[PDB]
Design an enzyme around this catalytic site. Structure first.
Site, PDB file in Angstrom:
ATOM      1  N   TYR A  21      18.175  15.391  52.771  1.00  0.00           N
ATOM      2  CA  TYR A  21      18.349  13.958  51.730  1.00  0.00           C
ATOM      3  C   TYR A  21      19.681  14.081  50.887  1.00  0.00           C
ATOM      4  O   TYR A  21      19.886  12.931  50.751  1.00  0.00           O
ATOM      5  CB  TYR A  21      16.675  14.875  50.908  1.00  0.00           C
ATOM      6  CG  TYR A  21      15.801  14.664  51.722  1.00  0.00           C
ATOM      7  CD1 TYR A  21      15.515  12.993  50.913  1.00  0.00           C
ATOM      8  CD2 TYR A  21      15.228  14.895  52.484  1.00  0.00           C
ATOM      9  CE1 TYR A  21      14.073  12.356  51.418  1.00  0.00           C
ATOM     10  CE2 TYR A  21      13.682  14.423  53.399  1.00  0.00           C
ATOM     11  CZ  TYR A  21      13.792  13.245  52.545  1.00  0.00           C
ATOM     12  OH  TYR A  21      11.998  12.465  53.364  1.00  0.00           O
ATOM     13  N   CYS A  29       5.772  10.278  55.481  1.00  0.00           N
ATOM     14  CA  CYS A  29       5.403  11.869  54.956  1.00  0.00           C
ATOM     15  C   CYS A  29       5.335  13.128  55.527  1.00  0.00           C
ATOM     16  O   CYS A  29       4.367  13.447  56.048  1.00  0.00           O
ATOM     17  CB  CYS A  29       4.885  12.027  53.446  1.00  0.00           C
ATOM     18  SG  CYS A  29       5.244  13.344  52.155  1.00  0.00           S
TER      19      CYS A  29
END
Lengths: 327, 327
Positions: free
Chosen positions: B194, B62
């Protein structure tokens, strides 16, 4: 897809096997066009080469059909073979004659609505897949062949006494080499990309994708030695490889996860790509909207959103030097 | 995924809204480590800087969590901050302490089995996202912070008196520039990918993806003027871009379909990428197995088969010369 009697079966193709071999309809369209109407090695006779009899139904997306259009240009067969282009989105009816897409022509012969109607016309009880390309006989209302490899050989010699441009893409001196290349590139490439793109486990994806990049490395050595795969003459083995290469970056890199390198990263593969792309006639057989819409949208299992990736940057009109470098 | 009281809600969140983005704890934990134990600008005290007390929970996959590991290395905070690594596969449960996967450590304090147990152990009536990184107080068994940007700002200074390595990655002189950069890079790129990656509309997709590539080009221009984003000093803005860049080729390009150009195609962005990668200790914070498993296996909506692509070729250990070229 599939016809069963048919009896198009939108998918149910079909209730398992249990009968059986789709079938007797397997061998259904393997006749040969010949200079004198004798039977070729399979099928029956009756298909003498001549003007105004034969027609090609193709998709611009499909490599198998592409190769028949390329050979039609190289051989100068446009005066003898007219063409319709199915629509690129191939959904629950399989290929369609919808002409709402630029360059889709509709069935310019019978205006059917689906390619499967051409097949039913030729054979009302047909069972099997309904594919492009189809080499159709407008005098007998039937299918001479829908085997792409064999249509390219017909086109290579059958019209030669009727005015076809001089050119043999399968000449006897090179046939043995061409056959070895064709089987190795089929296996590891033209159909190693498809095993990667539709693999279901990682082990399977992995072993496929590795064959793809190992073959591309080997090809890059062969095409670093001479202009084409067998030497300095263009053959059908180069044409077959080229129709896979021209779709590699627009689609297989991202759609099928063949993403280790782009063809633009290989000096010799990428020069071979432009070299053929730049031959008089061939650019116009290439239609990237069709190719892209077709692969991205038709394969919902792989790409559920149907979004078309913006795509690897590239420019196939850049000069390539390969006409000089070698030899 | 999300906690509701909770009361972990696997996937469902849920069947209606009408106010609003949960909740009174949508800040969550916004306390600060201070060298004296006084409240930081938000939150309460007294989280004084000291050894044997603080712990980070993170994923290697992440980027918000990755930046905390890099600042831990750059600042010499190993002897101050112990670390636990969640498993890279984030399914129905959200992050997990499953430890069957090289470098996933399980919860090395309390052997909880889900990250949401930590957030509940600390507020049992908690509502909102259960995210990494989390900076945990082993003394009071509570979470100082789960805001990445503040954790890294605490690390600049909170430990200097006690012996941290010299460096300040958010200096007052550069803060205004750093904040502008942090903004458009978030809008157009860290988030841009994203957005493209999750678009449902093709038109949404086009829009996102084009913005990504328009920002890359602007960056590639800035980074051709000096070694780093604001000049010749390294800052947290550089570390925030880097953390995105370093996932761009192995994930974003294929998995999020941002595929017009690979970072390895841009002279300055890829040298910037290699420049920070090669700083002593940064490499070991980068684990591409976690990264690629996390993203290809966890987004089952984008990637039905969870097949991890072989991945764009790159080699981050090639000398980059940006130490010499500048200034």
């Amino acid at each position: 897809g599939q016809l069963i009697d048919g009896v198009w079966h939108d998918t149910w193709y079909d209730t398992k096997s249990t009968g059986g071999k789709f079938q007797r309809s397997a061998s259904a369209f393997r006749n040969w066009l010949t200079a004198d109407g004798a039977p070729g090695p399979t099928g029956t006779g009756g298909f003498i080469a001549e003007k105004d009899r034969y027609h090609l139904y193709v998709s611009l997306a499909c490599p198998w059909a592409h190769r028949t259009l390329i050979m039609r240009k190289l051989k100068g067969l446009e005066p003898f073979i007219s063409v319709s282009v199915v629509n690129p989105l191939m959904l629950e009816n399989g290929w369609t004659f919808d002409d709402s897409f630029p360059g889709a022509t509709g069935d310019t012969l019978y205006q059917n609505e689906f390619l499967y109607q051409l097949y039913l016309h030729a054979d009302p009880h047909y069972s099997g897949r309904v594919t492009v390309p189809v080499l159709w006989d407008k005098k007998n209302h039937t299918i001479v062949s829908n085997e792409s490899a064999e249509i390219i050989r017909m086109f290579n010699t059958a019209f030669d006494a009727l005015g076809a441009k001089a050119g043999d893409y399968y000449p006897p001196a090179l046939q043995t080499k061409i056959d070895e290349l064709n089987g190795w590139i089929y296996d590891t490439v033209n159909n190693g990309v498809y095993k990667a793109g539709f693999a279901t486990s990682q082990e399977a994806y992995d072993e496929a994708v590795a064959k793809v990049f190992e073959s591309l490395a080997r090809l890059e050595q062969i095409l670093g030695q001479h202009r084409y795969l067998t030497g300095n003459q263009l053959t059908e083995a180069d044409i077959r490889l080229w129709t896979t290469l021209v779709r590699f970056d627009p689609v297989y890199v991202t759609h099928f996860k063949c993403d280790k390198h782009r063809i633009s990263d290989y000096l010799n593969l990428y020069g071979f790509l432009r070299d053929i792309y730049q031959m008089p006639g061939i650019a116009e057989t290439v239609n990237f909207d069709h190719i892209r819409n077709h692969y991205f949208r038709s394969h919902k299992t792989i790409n559920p959103t149907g979004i078309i990736s913006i795509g690897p940057w590239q420019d196939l009109d850049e000069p390539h030097g390969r006409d000089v470098r070698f030899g």
